[PDB]
Structures are given as structure tokens and as C-alpha cells.
A paper describes a structure:
Similar to other bacterial YCC β-subunits, MccB has 3–2 symmetry and is composed of three individual dimers that form a ring-like hexamer. Each monomer can be divided into two domains harbouring two copies of the crotonase fold that pack together in an antiparallel manner to form a dimer.
The active site of MccB is located at the dimerization interface for two opposing monomers where residues 137–237 from the N-terminus of monomer B are packed against residues 392–492 from the C-terminus of the next proximal monomer F. The individual monomers themselves superimpose well with a backbone Cα RMSD of 0.167 Å. Overall, MccB has a high degree of structural similarity to the previously solved β-subunit of propionyl-CoA carboxylase PccB from Streptomyces coelicolor21, with a Cα backbone RMSD of 0.738 Å. The greatest structural deviations of MccB from previously solved structures occur near residues 33–46 and 452–477. Residues 452–477 of MccB could not be modelled in the apo structure, highlighting this region's high degree of flexibility. In contrast, the region corresponding to residues 452–477 for PccB adopts a partially ordered helix–loop–helix motif. The high flexibility of MccB in the vicinity of the substrate binding pocket is consistent with its ability to bind larger acyl-CoA substrates than PccB.
Residue numbers in the entry:
A (entry chain A): 12 to 75, 81 to 454, 475 to 532
B (entry chain D): 106 to 449, 479 to 532
C (entry chain F): 15 to 74, 81 to 216, 219 to 452, 480 to 532
Write the structure that this text describes.
């Protein structure tokens, strides 16, 4: 019911707003704080620019307790001045459970984001499906999932996991481009610990089964884990600072403080590669020499540490970095590193971010484990990602460049636009220990260098390492107007 | 030709394969590669790698453009695996073929593992464990025959139509159809063979099965209805109660995306209780890998018909070609149980009628009618046109 | 339970949903001289071709189907989608379940590109559902707008159709009502009389919309005739705006016939004597037959679909038997929308012209003959389908400009020796020297001057010569036609 008078309806609206927000927030704060968690609205407030939030569907209700908003807070705002859409589950209101009203609110802000081409950040903290709504619940899960698939590579999609996330709740995060978890308040699994322990013979805790560390290091479902909710939200904002709003519009360009000439940071790369091939180096020291301010945002820091995927800038422009890391498993490629880099590269290609590869790859990790778990069809994903991509590709060969690993890591035949090799680059069909299908020191002298590849034009230049920053910046600037045609098809058939 | 220079990859060799692949892309016809190689020609150094890469690149730019089929009829190691891995179907032959990125010499010298080539990457390994092999022939005649039969279902390319064959379906109800009224057991812990339903519906009771020895809890096959190519994805309760898991999800997911690329409609037979639980499945990444099948269904635009024979719980029901994921026609049997969960109640909710009340299902039929209604739906959907997101490509989880 | 028991349980609800519901519905509808929703679906579609969807959908008394029968089928072998309100169940009123069923049939028809036939017989909005009903009305309306010119849309009005119920029929391409059993109005006679005293038939009965308002393109004597009318109409149309129209075999005489020669005498000698333009049209079309649109509305103009050599042809022709064939508001809007529809579905336009000018008067000017008569000019100029024009007699000023003259875009314009193509008539220019087509012919504004007996023969040839016509269109979301 409503009042009749105009002033009384304005007052009545103020009362319902008071109940739906101010009251609902006080009380949610009490229940969440005793579990070390923030409220849906506190997270929205930390994520968005102050004063930018426009809340939608504040007075939506389900159709049979009927709290305003139905357990999710939705709307849009800005992050560092650029528009974004937002939803944030309220775990304290009907469990943040997936219902038709809840789901319709999330569907609307997703439709809006697709309509204007802006990113979507989902803040997840849910008790799961709303069982009393029966199959209706499933329908809306599927609706949201379908939008994720139709937004994939169109608008950036980021998932923050800041509470329970089980069952159908895992479906939308799984389809977004980045999933960010938080240290002690989040977990993630399709099937829960109690039923795993009831049908399978396994007694496991929620954190052992699908805690943050599991997905950051073992399954690879988590691209970053924040120490606290603030650290995760900050990571998300920093990531958005590298991305375009959509796959058509340009990425942001920032002012820079790049040295035009040789610096001591540049001269340090002349000694970064050890004399002995037993000794490794930290690729990060190479990467930081090239990127603006020596800084980058690392994707999957704790997953497949034998390869680095990161976003940085050169002369104020977004650049994606993929680099073999000799500090872990000698920088060989394997299943985890290949899927890690493969999806990173395909994402950057969709949103027109050029890829800067630093190569030092001795080969693949050999064992029964790798073959039986499918290194062929899963390692080939990185080949597919490189060959499919049309963004500018610049490749710096620092050391090992053996066989298929060399082929995959942004070689010129796979589509790289500029390939430079240091004199430490060893570009060969295989190492000298493997080439005894026909003394290994002699082979090492003839072929442990880039000059056969350079002689065939497979690399474009062989430079002193200190020139790297400079040449990368040149190559990048020369490639910004690149246009490359794509095969005509509904889509490819990438191995899965 | 393995007997000539080891059948090894070089610039001349490689340029010959480059020329035939360029031709096939040029006229839009399928490519069948027959592999039997000692590997890279090391005397040619990086040249060999370059050409491997060239062929790989062509495979990627042909993916979803022309059907690509790889027969592995011998050794296939190192660089040799790259092109087969990128084609759409890999067919091996027992006793004579194997595939691995790194060979046993290096596995033992680097990892301390003593394994033979056949244990490391033999046909059984790739047909049953890794999934790299979509079919393994007993002999070469059987593998070649399999490849030709497969081609008989497929269009030459992603624009031209698939072949249509002469037909012999009985116009009215048969006893094979009426047999489906009895296939679902009364007792719910008792299973049935989903293959009997599939063979009841398809022409000649026949289908060419993809990945027969891999993830047998799901069936992927090509068959025909009234002479037209139809792709079948079906839960098989004979293995793991028809549960979904990592292997089944990736198997069906790629099958569906390939069929979508070449305009083959997808007919789903649903009977899924849920997902396989365990530390194994979660830590091996069931979230991001199981979701691949959801991506495949939701992305696809070919006609999709779904027959719900029995269990239809939660996310399993969502993924298996529900209407909300994009299916154009969804019919349910009276044995269909469409609910959020099973018993985590059974009398009021163990049936298709709440989903039917919401229009989430289009149809509740006696099973003997399935073949007929499926045929009608398929024929009614051949002119389907559906728009696709504008993008270079999506960002499917890998 | 048991598997056999669930099959039997399903048989019980199926009989409950259709057979028992059908006999009660048939009773309550026969009590008003109307057939059932399912009976009409069965008269419309090919026997046994109907596939019903959403048979057990229920709202949130809960009857199966929620008061509308939805599905798809074939008409004379070609696929069509159909919905049919059941007035006896919950008033055949618009609710969310009801609405979702028609939305699904509409989505399907848009998806496969086949026509939609809606059969309307509704108590209006389901008030108990509040705004939900409006929401769903709107959904359906939007789909009509996005189907407009994409798939043929036909509305059968076979009972009450008031309030929100009028919105979707108004947006379809053809609305057909039935004598004595149907009516249409935005607001009902109750409130209309409460600000004025009127009955439903005088406010919005079929005769009103067939002759006065123009909302009804045809009125059937009974339901069977209206349905037959719709099937005959679909036999002329493509399934959608991309795929070709049906082509039938014919037995056209290859040479000049006596039927052809009868037109040499059809135009009277003295210019105050009028003729029946229909005799010319029937001389040109296959079997002397055509399907007339808006037969009782603006009868100074004829709009019809016929065939030449088995191919669909649209005919727009001035009719001197009514208002001497002048153009007016009603005739302009009728012909204009017919032409735009035919252009959307790639049906060529055959014009027969005998136009002395416009109907004069305060009535016509004050009600906007400028902005509404100009719609027909827009329709001709916008259209890109082949346009063939036969000028039988009067060809005066803007009237001649509008009916498919060559400068407005016609591809072939032939004139009889009785054609008087002039800037204005004899009385207004202050004529024996100008009462003829030859200054127009001398300028090439007409392409040929023929003896009337040649008409059919040249028309057919022109038609056959133009099937591969392509014409570029302005780059725009859409135009700004006057409304």
C-alpha cells in the first residue's frame, strides 16, 4: 500500500529505502563480520569510484519473507573514470541464493553491459541455489551462463570470489576471464565436502578440497588470491586499468617516463645471462628492464611458475608478456604452463592487446604423467593461441630455443611480426645431447647460437641484450596499425 | 613414406604438404593426412621446425573451415604430433602406431622412468586415458574405412551442405519404437543401455561412434534421420551411472563445437544425475574443464533437439542441452525427473511436469513417439538462422 | 510408481488437457456460434501436421495450456506457426504462461523464417496478473515489430478482441475478421457510451473495420471462409523475405486471345462513361482470378494478389466505378501499405492506371491528404521490386506521378491509345491535342504505346524480363515515412 498525498509517498519511499539499504546493511554487517567478511555494499563501495554507483532493482522482490533486492545488489558505476557494471551477492539475505528475481537482476546488468560494451565485475558470496524455487533456480543459472558465453571476448568479465561458491554458483565464474579469490573466506567446488565424503571414500575439508591455494596452485581456476578483500579488489581495478572497455574500443594510453637512450637498467641485461648453461637467471629481471617503471601485473603467479603471464606497458601502451621462466622446472613447457599462457594469449588477442614473448625454452617436461594426461592435445593449445592471434607479436629470444618449444613460443613462422635474438640464443632443432641419432661439445659449438636461424631469416635481428627495451619499443610503435584477416567460419575447433 | 629418408620432415617434404593443404583450403575440400614418420630431418636444422610450424599454422587457419582428419599409421613423436593434434579427428592403428611429445630414451634419462613406446603413448593410452585418439582401428583397413564412413556424414567445408541420402524409415509406429516404452527400468538403481534408445531413433539403427573407448559415461556419435546427418550426444548410465566428469565434458564439448562449425544438428539424450565427486576431479580442474561443455552448447547455433529420458538434476540438466542453454526443441518422457536435486520429495518432484508447467520443456511424450517427433523437429529446423556475437573469437576456458 | 504407470499417468493428463477440455470448450463456444481454438487450428492446418508445444504449461484453477493452444504445422505443404486463443479457459486472457507460449511460437517462426498465423478470441488482459499481463502484451508486440517485413504475419479475429488484445493484430500484415462473431476496439462500448450510447457491433463490428476504419483486410462469412481466405493468401507469399515465392504451373495462351481482344472495346468512347477496371485485371491475370485485399475499403482503388505465368503478382489499380477512380486518403493508405508489404516480400507490383486526380474538399485537406496521400508516393519510390505500369486512360498530374510512373521508379510503363497523360485535365488548364499519350511517349516518359489487346502479353514478358532485377537502397536504419 501507498499513501495518497505526494509528500507522504516521498516519505514512504524514504522509509522503504531505509529498510532496503541502511537497515539491511546494518544487519548484514553484523552477520558477515563474525565470519571475517564484508557486506555486498561495502565491497561495491571499495570497488567503484566514490559517488559513481547507480543501483538498479533496489525494490525487486521474489514472488511468494520478501526482502528488497532479493539477496543481490546490482548496478553500474565507474572504475578510475571508465564505466563498469557490478553485481554483489548478499550472503546474509536468503543466503545470497539464486532465484528468479536475483537472477533477473544480474541478467539485466549483464544485458546493459553487453549493450554499451563495458566490463562486468561479479562479486560472489552465495549459499547456492534457492531450493524452494525448484528448477526455476537452474534456469537462471543457465541464463547467466549463456550471457557469459555470448560476452566472451566481447566485454572483459571478472569474478571476485569472496565467500562460499559451490554447485551452480561456480558456473559463471568458470566462464569469465579472470577469477580472483581471497585468502580465508572463499572456497570453490562443484560438489561439496560432505557429499564427497558420503559417496566417495574421502574425508576432506572445504579448504583442502577447493580452498584458494588449491585453485591458485593445483587446478588453476584462480588467477589471483588476495590476502584480504581489499587486496583482491585492488588487483581487479589494476587489471581493468590495462584493458579496453570492449573488443572494439582502444585500451587506455598513459603518459610515460621512458628513457630515450641507454640506461644502466638496460646495460644490466648484457650480464643477466650466466656463462654456464647449468646456471639459471630470473626472467623477471629481463621483463622489468623492458616495461615502463619495471612494473607488471602477473596473472596466475602461483600456477605453472615455469611460465610468466603478465600485463605491463611500453611507452604507456598495454602490452601482454609471455615468458619462459628458467627458475622453475628449468623453464620447460608442460600442460599447466601451456593452458595458462594459451588462454592468456587468446584473451589478449580478443581485446587487441599486443603480445611480447621472452623465450628461453629447453623443451617439454617428459614423463608418463605428461603424456597420459594429454600434453599433445593440451600443449597444442598454446600453438593454437599464437597462430590464431592477429595482435602484434614481438619475440625476444634470450637463450634456449629448441624444437617445438621454439616453434610454439612466438617464432616467426607461427605469426610473430618481429623476432630478435640475443647472442645467447641457441636456436636449433634440438639440444646437443638429443642430436645423437647420428662430440656433443662440437655440435654445441656449431649450433649453440642464433646465426643459422638468422641466416635463413627466421629471426629478424641479433642484438646486444642492452638494446632490447629500445627495439621492443620501436617494434611495438611500428605495429599499432597492423591489420590481419581472419578465416571465415562461425568459429574454430581448438583442442579442448 | 617411412622407408624414404625415414619419412622425415624437411623443406621439400614440408612444401609438398604445404601445397596440398593450400589447395584444399583454396577449393574447400577435406584433408586426410596419413602419418608415419621418423621425425625431424636433423641435417636440415631449424628448417624442419619451420615447416612443422607452417603446417601447424595452416591447420589452425583451416580449423572449422575444412574437415581435417589425421591417420596415425606408425611412429609419431616430437614435432610430428603438432599437426595431428590440431586436426579434428585422430585415428590410430594398434601394434604399429604411437604418439608422444618426448620419447622413452629421454623419459628415462631425464625422469628416471623405464617405459616402452607403447606404454608411453600407445594406441590404448590415447584411446582410453589421454583422449588424443578418437578411434583406434584393429588394422589399417578398419581405420581407413572408419575415416571414409566419417567423411560420408560431413560437408566438404563450412559453407556447402552435408550429403543427403536415400531413406527407408517406416512411416508409422514400429515395434522398435514401442520397445522404448519399456526400456526405462521400474527400479531407479537399475540402469539401461542408452544405445538402445539411440538406435531406435536413427536410420538403420546405426551410428559412427566418436571416442568409443574414452569417457564411456557419455556417447558422441554421428547418425542420420531421414537421410540427413545428425550428431548425437547422450549420457550413458551403463558407465558411472551416466555421470558427467572432466573427460566426458571435454569429449562432448569438442564434438559439439566441431559439429557446430560444419552445420550438423545436435540431438541430446539426457539422463544425468550430476557430476562425479572427488578430490581428483576438483583439483584436476573440473570447474574450468567441465564448463567447456556448457560453452559448447551455449555458443552453438545449429538446430538442437533434446530428449530427456530420465534423470535431469541441477547443473547436469542445465548443461545437457536444456532450453535455457539454447535448445530449440526439448521433449521429456514420463520417466524424466527434472528437478534441482534428487534427494539432497521423490514422489511430487520426480517427474517432468513442473518443468512442463513453466514451459522449460516443450513436450511430454510416450517414448514410442520419440523417433517420430525427433524427425519432425529436425525437419522443421533446417532453415534455422541465428546471429553470433561479433568478435575475433571467444575466450573459452582451456 | 512404475514406468508403465507413468506412461498411463501421462495419457490421463493428455486426455484431461485436450479431449475433456475440448468438449467443454466446444460446448461453451457452440453456445455463441463459434468453434474451438483446436477446431480452428484443425481447419487451418494440413491434417496430422500439427505439433503442439507447451501442452502442459500452467500458470503460477490451473488449467493445462493456460488458455492458448500453440504449435507449428504445414499449410499446403509449407511450414507455418500458429497460436489460437481459447476463450472458454480463463477467458482466453493474456497472462505470463499464455504469453510465454505465444512468445515461444513467435521466436521459433523468427528463428526458421516461416509465417505466423494468430487466431484471436480473448477476454482481454488477465487482471489478476497485474502488470505482468501488460509486460507480455508488450513482448508479443515487440516481436511483431521485429518480424515486420521479415515473415508474413496474419491475424484472424474470431471473437472479442478489445483493449490490449488489439495490439498484436494491429502490427501484423493482414487482419481477417468473421461476420457476426468478432469485434475490435481499444475501448469498449460501456465506457465509450459513458462519455457518449453504442453497442459492440456499431463501435467495432466487422463492417466498421472493413469499410470505415480499414483495420480489416477481409471479413469472412463464417470461420471456414476466413480460414480459406488465409490459406489462399499464404499460397501467394514466400515463407520469409529471403526465400522465393511459390511458382505454379500454368496454361497461358502463347498468342493473342479473344479475351485479349475484348480490351480493345473496354474503354467507353465518351469520357463521362466509366468501366470496370476489374475486367482489365482479369484479362491480364492467370485464370482471370485474383485475391482482393480490403474489398470493401476505399473501393475507388483495387489491391489484389494474382499470378502471371504461375508467378505471384501484386496489382494496384484505380477503379473508376467508385468516385471515378480518384485518389483519396483511404485509397492512398490502403495501396501504400499493400505496396510496402509486397516490396518487403519481393512480390512485383503491377499497376493499372486511370486516375483523374484527387478527391477535393475541406474533408480531405483538413484530415491530411497531404501527409497521408503522400504515403503512396513514398511506397512506390521506396520499393525496389519490379514495377510494371499499364496506363488505360486518365493520367493527370500528381495522380499520374504517383501510380507507378516511370520517374517514380517503374521499370516498364506501357500506355493504351486512350491514355491521356497530361499535367492537368482540359477544364483546369484555362483538349483534343493533349488527350493522348504521345507527348509523354515523345519524351520517353512511357516506354511503349500499345493497343489494349497486347497488354497481358507485354506484361508477362516484362515480368519475365525483370526477375533478376537488383536495386541499391539508401544506407540508413530506416526512413522517415510520413505517418
Amino acid at each position: 500500500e501507498s499513501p495518497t498525498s505526494t509528500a507522504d509517498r516521498i516519505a514512504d519511499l524514504a522509509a522503504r529505502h531505509e529498510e532496503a539499504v541502511v537497515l539491511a546493511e546494518k544487519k548484514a554487517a553484523d552477520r558477515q563480520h563474525l565470519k571475517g567478511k564484508l557486506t555486498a555494499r561495502a565491497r561495491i563501495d571499495l570497488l567503484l569510484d566514490p559517488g559513481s554507483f547507480v543501483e538498479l532493482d533496489e525494490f525487486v522482490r521474489h514472488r511468494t519473507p520478501r526482502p528488497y533486492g532479493d539477496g543481490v545488489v546490482t548496478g553500474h558505476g565507474t572504475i578510475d573514470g571508465r564505466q563498469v557494471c557490478v553485481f554483489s551477492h548478499d550472503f546474509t539475505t536468503l543466503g545470497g541464493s539464486m532465484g528468479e528475481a536475483f537472477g533477473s537482476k544480474v541478467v539485466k546488468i549483464y544485458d546493459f553491459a553487453m549493450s554499451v560494451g563495458c566490463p562486468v565485475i561479479g562479486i560472489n558470496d552465495s549459499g547456492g541455489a534457492r531450493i524452494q524455487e525448484g528448477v526455476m533456480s537452474i534456469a537462471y543459472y543457465t541464463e547467466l551462463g549463456v550471457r557469459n558465453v555470448h560476452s566472451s571476448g566481447v566485454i572483459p568479465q571478472i569474478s571476485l570470489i569472496m565467500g562460499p561458491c559451490a554447485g551452480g554458483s561456480v558456473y559463471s565464474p568458470a566462464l569469465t576471464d579472470f577469477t580472483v579469490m581471497v585468502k580465508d573466506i572463499s572456497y570453490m567446488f562443484v560438489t561439496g565436502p560432505e557429499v564427497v565424503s558420503a559417496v566417495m571414500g574421502e574425508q576432506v575439508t572445504a579448504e583442502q578440497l577447493g580452498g584458494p591455494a588449491v585453485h591458485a596452485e593445483v587446478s588453476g581456476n584462480a588467477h589471483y588470491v588476495g590476502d584480504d578483500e581489499q587486496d583482491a579488489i585492488s588487483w581487479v581495478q589494476t587489471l581493468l586499468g590495462y584493458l579496453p572497455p570492449n573488443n572494439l574500443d582502444p585500451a587506455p594510453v598513459y603518459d610515460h617516463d621512458c628513457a630515450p637512450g641507454i640506461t644502466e637498467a638496460d646495460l644490466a641485461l648484457d650480464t643477466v645471462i650466466p656463462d654456464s648453461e647449468q646456471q639459471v637467471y630470473d626472467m623477471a629481471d629481463v621483463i622489468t628492464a623492458v616495461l615502463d617503471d619495471g612494473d607488471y601485473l602477473e596473472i596466475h603467479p602461483d600456477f605453472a611458475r615455469n611460465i610468466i603471464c603478465a600485463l605491463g606497458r611500453v611507452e604507456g601502451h598495454s602490452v601482454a608478456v609471455v615468458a619462459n621462466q628458467p627458475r622453475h622446472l628449468a623453464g620447460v613447457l608442460d600442460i599447466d604452463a601451456s593452458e595458462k599462457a594459451a588462454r592468456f594469449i587468446r584473451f589478449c588477442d580478443s581485446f587487441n592487446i599486443p603480445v611480447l614473448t621472452f623465450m628461453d625454452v629447453p623443451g617439454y617436461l617428459p614423463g608418463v604423467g605428461q603424456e597420459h594426461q594429454g600434453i599433445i592435445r593440451r600443449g597444442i593449445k598454446l600453438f593454437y593461441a599464437y597462430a590464431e592471434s592477429t595482435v602484434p607479436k614481438i619475440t625476444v629470444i634470450t637463450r634456449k630455443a629448441y624444437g617445438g618449444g621454439y616453434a610454439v613460443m612466438g617464432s616467426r613462422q607461427i605469426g610473430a611480426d618481429r623476432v630478435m635474438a640475443w647472442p645467447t640464443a641457441e636456436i636449433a632443432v634440438m639440444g646437443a645431447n638429443s642430436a645423437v641419432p647420428i662430440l656433443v661439445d662440437d655440435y654445441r659449438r656449431r649450433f649453440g647460437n642464433p646465426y643459422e636461424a638468422a641466416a635463413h631469416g627466421y629471426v629478424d635481428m641479433v642484438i646486444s641484450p642492452s638494446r632490447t627495451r629500445y627495439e621492443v619499443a620501436r617494434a611495438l610503435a611500428s605495429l599499432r596499425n597492423k591489420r590481419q584477416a581472419r578465416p571465415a567460419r562461425k568459429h574454430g575447433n581448438i583442442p579442448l
